[PDB]
Design a protein around this ligand. Sequence first.
Ligand SMILES: *C(=O)[C@@H](NC(=O)[C@H](NC(=O)N1CCN(CC)C(=O)C1=O)c1ccc(O)cc1)[C@@H]1N[C@@H](C(=O)O)[C@@H](C)CS1
Ligand SMILES: [Cl-]
Ligand SMILES: [Cl-]
Ligand SMILES: [Cl-]
Length: 514
Amino acid sequence: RSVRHIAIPAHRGLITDRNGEPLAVSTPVTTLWANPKELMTAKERWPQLAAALGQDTKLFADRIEQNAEREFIYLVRGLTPEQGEGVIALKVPGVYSIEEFRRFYPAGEVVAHAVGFTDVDDRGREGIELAFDEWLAGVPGKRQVLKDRRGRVIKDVQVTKNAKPGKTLALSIDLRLQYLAHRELRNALLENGAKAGSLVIMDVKTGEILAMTNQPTYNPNNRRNLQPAAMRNRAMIDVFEPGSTVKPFSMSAALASGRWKPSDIVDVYPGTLQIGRYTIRDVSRNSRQLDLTGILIKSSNVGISKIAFDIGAESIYSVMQQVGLGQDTGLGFPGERVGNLPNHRKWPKAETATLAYGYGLSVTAIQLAHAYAALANDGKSVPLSMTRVDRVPDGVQVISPEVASTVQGMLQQVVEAQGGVFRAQVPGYHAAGKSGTARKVSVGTKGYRENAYRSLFAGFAPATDPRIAMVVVIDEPSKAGYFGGLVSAPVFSKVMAGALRLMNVPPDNLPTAT
Ligand SMILES: *C(=O)[C@@H](NC(=O)[C@H](NC(=O)N1CCN(CC)C(=O)C1=O)c1ccc(O)cc1)[C@@H]1N[C@@H](C(=O)O)[C@@H](C)CS1
Ligand SMILES: [Cl-]
Ligand SMILES: [Cl-]
Ligand SMILES: [Cl-]
């Protein structure tokens, strides 16, 4: 007869949203174990015990007989505390209970990518659970039990070490906006027959990530049939060419250069522009000349190319780096990518062009939203945060108030003007933003696919005092068009309207309110 040492399960720290809503919680459960040696002295209680555990009488009997010489086996794990003491009430000799915890995710698939999960051993393996594992993990206690010759538990002798709970972590996420964002992205995925998507909502003034959702997603409370594809927090860990969505930054470089002003007109006839062996092409070849604003409204590649040739790549590269494209966010989310902003010594005409209209670089959805947040925040960039922020941090002026203000105005025109991106309009509010439509990279070679696109829309609102920026990305829609302003803009409209209402933001455009 010896003294066995056994663990005292500790509480894992609570993860909440920014308002205290539970996202990850350690819920008390009871596991039943048995001493076969003791159970063998009470065989006639078996059929009753077997039925209380929902097991076939003979199969249960087989289990115990196969482990007869043994002193410890598990009967069932993770019952409710009531279920456990219900069975313990049967007073079957050799049946014991252990009070433990199971990690439970109340929002399930809605916040799976941000939150992640713990594995069997209670260690974080994905998402925030992994990133803050040290913080969240408690330290298990220990106690001593005396058992006799036949393994029968005789006495609880002492607690050698108390258990200590993990610490509470409050995320920057607003679960209300996360629900709204999650449902709308799913709907659009399904309407459009798309393969994947992301949606990011950011507070432009504080840097707090208010929502981050992706499709495909999964249920962390039930991972039985989980495939690896569904696990990716795409918004942070997948990179893409932003296409036309970087034009407002190219345009920001232009206005900062002293060589351009909004009234300037650019001749974009014939809608192509040969340079070398490569042809810069416009998709909407309907106008012959466009002012600066009209270059954004019609999303003219030729137009932006000509401005780019005039100002040079370095000024464009510069603004893109400054707003944080291809830069480290400093969030340290597991697997998070920085993307790439190519740095050349000599910038040929083509590479200057393709950079200015958003190819040759790669960003994440979170980075894109960050850049639009800076633009919306009168040119002041603020560090990203995925945890609740108490004090509004000190920002860095990355674009002058004046340039930012002008570019905000052009983007508002992109949504509201005739021939604009009208599906992006937000009932009740003035919205600003920019669509994008980008050919996907060829599988198995260099170059681009002729029929697979990524639909983008990026923006902020309300125009008169911007509070939130948003990025909607949808991959390979195949059912109802593929242009950014057809596919992603209506999602922007719907989510933005809901978000601003949920945040009680006063409407700034009542003739369209509800
Ligand atoms: C902004 O996103 C614009 N989109 C396009 O021009 C794309 N272009 C491309 O995907 N690519 C791929 C790679 N290269 C060489 C490296 C290119 O030169 C290039 O242009 C595009 C291509 C085909 C089709 O059918 C559509 C788009 C403009 N933005 C949109 C928008 O706002 O969503 C529109 C309305 C005009 S095209
Ligand atoms: Cl990276
Ligand atoms: Cl953070
Ligand atoms: Cl791609």
